[PDB]
């Protein structure tokens, strides 16, 4: 909610409180999404200042407060900053910003990152360019310098982040995206490549010196309809764990596909149909193994701009012999959301 | 403070900064409340949206920031979310909400949960239904569907929370409360029962498969006077530690009593007299042992709605041979509070 | 930003989002400031209530959210409360407040604590009276009871904080400051002494029962110019580590000097020149060793009150044989700041 607008500066203070619960069978462990209470809240700010008529500064910070821990020792489980960056926007030359922010390949992956609760399985965080990263410098240009309406692009510089863990680390790398939008249609191409850290190189699964990720996207978004499709591939970048062995590393290659179709009724209801499949190839020891495979059915009902409710149902297609240990049971989530 | 009120939505952003210090003797350890700096701050939001004339949505999140840790390694000690939930309120049918929230037996226990700094000793958190829990679904009805003024009730569903620790865990359980209020008098009954987790069952102190808690409350709140009394019992639910042995578990039964009397002067002063006693029965190895036993004397001085100060003095009646290791020295707390 | 002003109460909600990166050579380790992403955000509140015409209450809380951790396990690294206190201000008698706050010797040290990114090296936190501490009671008087314009003083009571670590601990102690300001000139004297905890006493470096710190300050702040100088000494209080041995404790004595000169152009640019040196004497095993020694060159460019950018360059004078292990390579920091 915009709580401040004085002398050039507008501040927006936003957040949500989401009561959420997942119903899986068994112990949750062989199930898609797990099982039990999954409540959380969110809180962030979004500021913007008019430095002059062609020049804007802006900043953003967003945090996640888990709502399913006790008030003892486990208190902080899963609490974290999702976003923290500052930048400048100048007339038709472009914007530039630095900080923790969305990587360039998510410029494509967000097309299908629209289910009520699940989806966007290939857009992991702290995973090079596919979702939120730390340390990126991003340059974005709109409408080709003011010359071609709807033609945009971006380039992004990722700096090395040598963490304690191979999963949350990364060497230096560059990415970019090009996209075009016209009368409800949109098409996108994104691509990035990076160096893998020494600790990444020592993991038992995956071999190579460079991480790579790309995706393509197509969408029709108009007249209350939303249909979208994504297709992408990666070499050495997606995190995988062998649950039998307890080994870990990255998949040599993945070929990913995600399709979504939604409809917005005028009275508040938004049904969703979706399909997802992600498969790893040349996995040291295993061969071709599906990481993700399902059908999704769900609906959201918007009481207004601040209140909503939802059911999200995953008909998991993974099967019970999957060689990595990927679970095969379905999962249902029911949620009630207040936001401002 | 209500910082936002536009188009149906009202947002309230609230918090406090409390400088607090406790004076006990010795090393604090044989003392009621401990000794030294105990400063903290609080911050939360409370949102409400008018979906139509009979229909409201609402949400809440509240956090606790300890103010007595260093800026090193110990930084987060005792930081946590106290509340996180969302819900709907519909005309005279009732409200329903889900999330981390106050359990149903606190509907009774809050009567006496009114001292400046201490008190409400039997209302522990993450302890089934007596204070804040995670994962509860709560249904509350006011004025019996609009038919009887001042007659209210609630039912609450608690879902299993299998944590790392027996103290912060719980199986599934149900509770309810009934209460009546008329011309400054109020009476209440609450009751809940639950399953105990496997890890609870393995603790050395306490035996059984079900946790139970109930309390009764009576109050007179009018003409600046506040008098209130609570009486409750529990089987297998209250956490106890044997300090000699270092063993732990739950008390087989407790019989709890709490009485309070306050007065609100018109110039700002609010004196408080209180009495508290909590005793465990059939404690494996020990027998009947008092957990809590004291007299309280204290005063709060309200400078206004935002500023106040207080002294809270505990004349501890526990004695120096107590068989569980319960401390027996008094404790004094002095505090200065800013809130908005 | 002042988001609330109703019925006596004014609330200010403030914060920043700072994209920051340091460029050192090597592995960062033999370098002044280290190397890589160092982004963070900040968020705090500042409240004030008019209790009557001579009487004000106030409170403050401020937090630090690191922006350079992943969304896994390392999530909280370096997150903490910097400030949390409440107090009262009464006409010309003085203010009094309690909580986590700036210690009295920083009344002097802040003179030179003005570089874009670096500086103020002798003002460590949780280090007795030189920067932010926990548990202090502070009394401050302005203009000598209304009698002498510009003559101020303060007394501060520090209570024992027995933490897990010698570095973040402290016994009881008292401090004070006296200062005078006239037509752009200001002079200051601060002094405090404390008891050292048992764990402090057991560290291999440093010997004694009392910690002491003092500093003097001189400044000219007018007509867009800022020149300032600080001189201070400490006995047994500054934390030092021998990097060879891996031993730790406090320096027997330090003689500290800090000088700064800045200029504020009217178009937005603020160049900065600075010099710093801190040296420990009678270090058990070593003798006289420099802890800090450098030259600083930098500039900040203010786009407005909310947006700015900076470069801060440290020409490190420490040398490559330094006996404690102090690094000797330079460091450059580049930052972009949004604040409200």
Q: CA-CA distances (angstroms) from residue A31 to A141, C3, C301?
A: 42, 46, 54
Token readout for A130 is: 């596919």
Residues with Cβ within 8 Å of residue B34, at least 6 apart in sequence? B22, B24, B28, B331
Nearest CA in chain B to A19: B99
Cα–chain center distance at C207: 25
Closest among A104, A225, A202 to A156, alpha carbons compared? A104
What DSSP element (H or E) covers C296? Answer: strand C287-302
CA atoms within a 13 Å half-sphere pointing along the CA-CB vector of A48: 13
What DSSP element (H or E) covers B118? Answer: none
CA angle C39, C45, C49 (to 5 degrees): 165
Domains of chain C: 1-340 (2.40.160.10)
CB B246 within 8 A of CB B285: no
Rounded to a whole number, what is the distance in Å from the CA of A321 to chain C's nearest CA?
A: 29
Nearest CA in chain B to A67: B84
CB C228 within 8 A of CB C218: yes
CA angle A274, A280, A283 (to 5 degrees): 160
DSSP C16-58: EEEEEEEE-STTSTTBSS--EE--EEEEEEEEEEEEETTEEEE
CB contact under 8 A, C19 and A99: yes
Closest among B116, B307, B103 to C55, alpha carbons compared? B307
Rounded to a whole number, what is the distance in Å from the CA of C98 to chain B's nearest CA?
A: 5
Q: Measured between CB atoms, does A28 come within 8 Å of chain B? A: no
CB contact under 8 A, C98 and B19: yes
The number of residues in chain A equals 340
CA angle A260, A263, A265 (to 5 degrees): 160
Rounded to a whole number, what is the distance in Å from the CA of A148 to chain C's nearest CA?
A: 30
Chain A residues touching residue B88 (CB < 8 angstroms) = 307, 336
Nearest CA in chain C to A89: C307
Beta A210-222 vs A185-195: how paired, if at all?
antiparallel
CB C68 within 8 A of CB C99: no
Instruction: Please report where in the chains the tokens 């002042």 appear, as a residue.
Output: C2
Query: Hey, which chains touch A, using 3+ CB pairs under 8 Å?
Result: B, C
Q: Measured between CB atoms, does C21 come within 8 Å of chain A? A: yes
Question: In a 3-state reduction of DSSP, which class is residue C323?
Answer: coil
Query: Hey, which chains touch B, using 3+ CB pairs under 8 Å?
Result: A, C
* Residue A129 phi, psi dihedral angles, 5° rounding: -120, -5
For residue A287, the cross-strand partners are A283
CB contact under 8 A, C9 and B1: yes
Query: Hey, which chains touch C, using 3+ CB pairs under 8 Å?
Result: A, B
- Angstrom distance (rounded) from CA C291 to CA C122: 10
User: Which parts of C57-197 fold into alpha helices (H)?
Assistant: 106-109
Can you give the C-alpha Rg of chain B in angstroms?
A: 21
CB B128 within 8 A of CB B173: yes
What DSSP element (H or E) covers B238? Answer: none
CB contact under 8 A, A17 and B85: yes
CB C330 within 8 A of CB C312: no
Interface test with B, best of A17, A42, A43 (most B CBs within 10 A): A17
Q: Measured between CB atoms, does C220 come within 8 Å of chain B? A: no
- Angstrom distance (rounded) from CA B111 to CA B216: 10
Q: Measured between CB atoms, does C182 come within 8 Å of chain A? A: no
CB contact under 8 A, B55 and A339: no
Beta C307-316 vs C287-302: how paired, if at all?
antiparallel
- Angstrom distance (rounded) from CA C84 to CA B39: 8
Closest among C148, C158, C157, C222 to C179, alpha carbons compared? C148
User: Which parts of chain B fold into alpha helices (H)?
Assistant: 106-109, 198-201
SS (H, E, C) chain A: CEEEEECCEEEEEEEEEEEEEEECCCCCCCECCCCEECCEEEEEEEEEEEEECCEEEEEEEEEEEECCCCCCCCCCCCCEEEEEEEEEEECCCEEEEEEEEECCCHHHHCCCCCCCCCCCCCCCCCCCCCCEEEEEEEEEECCHHHCCCCEEEEEEEECCECCCCCCCCECCEEEEEEEEEECCEEEEEEEEEEECCHHHHCCCECCCCEEEEEEEEEEEEECCEEEEEEEEEEECCCEEEECCCCEEEECCEEEEEEEEEEECCCCCEEEEEEEEEEEEEEECCCEEEEEEEEEEEEEEEECCCCEEEEEEEEEECCCCCCCCCCCCECEEEEEEEEEC
Q: What is the resolution of this structure in A?
A: 3.0
How many other C-beta atoms lie within 10 A of the C-beta of residue C290? Answer: 16
Instruction: Please report where in the chains the tokens 């909280």 appear, as a residue.
Output: C76
Counting one residue from chain A and one from chain B, the pairs whose CB atoms sit within 8 A come to: 138
* Residue C140 phi, psi dihedral angles, 5° rounding: -130, 135
CB contact under 8 A, B126 and A17: no
For residue B331, the cross-strand partners are B314
CB contact under 8 A, C72 and A126: yes
- Angstrom distance (rounded) from CA C17 to CA A15: 17
CB C35 within 8 A of CB C72: no
| A164 vs C74, C307, C336: nearest CB | C74
* Residue C32 phi, psi dihedral angles, 5° rounding: -65, -60
Chain A residues touching residue B49 (CB < 8 angstroms) = 303-304, 306-307, 338
Q: Measured between CB atoms, does C81 come within 8 Å of chain B? A: yes
Q: CA-CA distances (angstroms) from residue B146 to A56, B92, B189, C269?
A: 54, 6, 21, 67
Chain B residues touching residue C200 (CB < 8 angstroms) = none
Taking the alpha carbons of A129, A133, A134, A137 in that order, is the dihedral positive or negative? positive
CB contact under 8 A, B336 and C98: yes
- Angstrom distance (rounded) from CA C29 to CA C46: 38
* Residue A73 phi, psi dihedral angles, 5° rounding: -40, -45
CB A57 within 8 A of CB A50: no
C109: exposed, middle or buried (C-beta count within 10 Å: 0-12, 13-18, 19+)?
Answer: buried
* Residue A109 phi, psi dihedral angles, 5° rounding: -70, -20
The number of residues in chain B equals 340
Rounded to a whole number, what is the distance in Å from the CA of A137 to chain C's nearest CA?
A: 9
Q: Measured between CB atoms, does B159 come within 8 Å of chain A? A: yes
Closest among A258, A256, A255 to A229, alpha carbons compared? A258
What DSSP element (H or E) covers B229? Answer: strand B225-235
The secondary structure of chain C in percent helix, strand, coil, rounded to multiples of 5, reads: 5, 60, 35
User: Which parts of chain C fold into alpha helices (H)?
Assistant: 106-109, 198-201
- Angstrom distance (rounded) from CA C128 to CA C174: 10
Closest among C244, C241, C328 to C293, alpha carbons compared? C328
Beta C210-222 vs C225-235: how paired, if at all?
antiparallel
Q: Measured between CB atoms, does B132 come within 8 Å of chain A? A: yes
For residue B293, the cross-strand partners are B277
| A9 vs C19, C65, C340: nearest CB | C340
Question: In a 3-state reduction of DSSP, which class is residue C150?
Answer: coil
Taking the alpha carbons of C120, C124, C128, C134 in that order, is the dihedral positive or negative? positive
Question: In a 3-state reduction of DSSP, which class is residue B107?
Answer: helix
CB A322 within 8 A of CB A11: no
- Angstrom distance (rounded) from CA A179 to CA A218: 10
Method: X-ray
């Amino acid at each position: 909610a915009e709580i401040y607008n004085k002398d050039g500066n507008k501040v927006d203070l936003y957040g949500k409180a989401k009561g959420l619960h997942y119903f899986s069978k068994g112990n949750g462990e062989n199930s898609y999404g797990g099982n039990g209470d999954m409540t959380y809240a969110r809180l962030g700010f979004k500021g913007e200042t008019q430095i002059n008529s062609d020049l804007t500064g802006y900043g953003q910070w967003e945090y996640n407060f888990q709502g399913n821990n006790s008030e003892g020792a486990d208190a902080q489980t899963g609490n974290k900053t999702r976003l923290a960056f500052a930048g400048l926007k100048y007339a038709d030359v472009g914007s530039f910003d630095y900080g923790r922010n969305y990587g360039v390949v998510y410029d494509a992956l967000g097309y299908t990152d629209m289910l009520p609760e699940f989806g966007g399985d290939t857009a992991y965080s702290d995973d090079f360019f596919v979702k939120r990263v730390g340390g990126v410098a991003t340059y974005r240009n709109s409408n080709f310098f003011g010359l071609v309406d709807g033609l945009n692009f971006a380039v992004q510089y990722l700096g090395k982040n040598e963490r304690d863990t191979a999963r949350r680390s990364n060497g230096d790398g560059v990415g970019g995206s090009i996209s075009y939008e016209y009368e409800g249609f949109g098409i996108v191409g994104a691509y990035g490549a990076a160096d893998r850290t020494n600790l990444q190189e020592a993991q038992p699964l995956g071999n190579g010196k460079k991480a790579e990720q790309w995706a393509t996207g197509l969408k029709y978004d108009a007249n209350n309809i939303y249909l979208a499709a994504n297709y992408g591939e990666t070499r050495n970048a997606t995190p995988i764990t062998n649950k039998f062995t307890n080994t870990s590393g990255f998949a040599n290659k993945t070929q990913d596909v995600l399709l979504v179709a939604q409809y917005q009724f005028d009275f508040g209801l938004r049904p969703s149909i979706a399909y997802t499949k992600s498969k790893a190839k040349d996995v040291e020891g295993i061969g071709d193994v599906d990481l993700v495979n399902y059908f999704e059915v769900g609906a959201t009902y918007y009481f207004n701009k601040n209140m909503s409710t939802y059911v999200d149902y995953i008909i998991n297609q993974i099967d019970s012999d999957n060689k990595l240990g990927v679970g095969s049971d379905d999962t249902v989530a029911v949620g009630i959301v207040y936001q401002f």
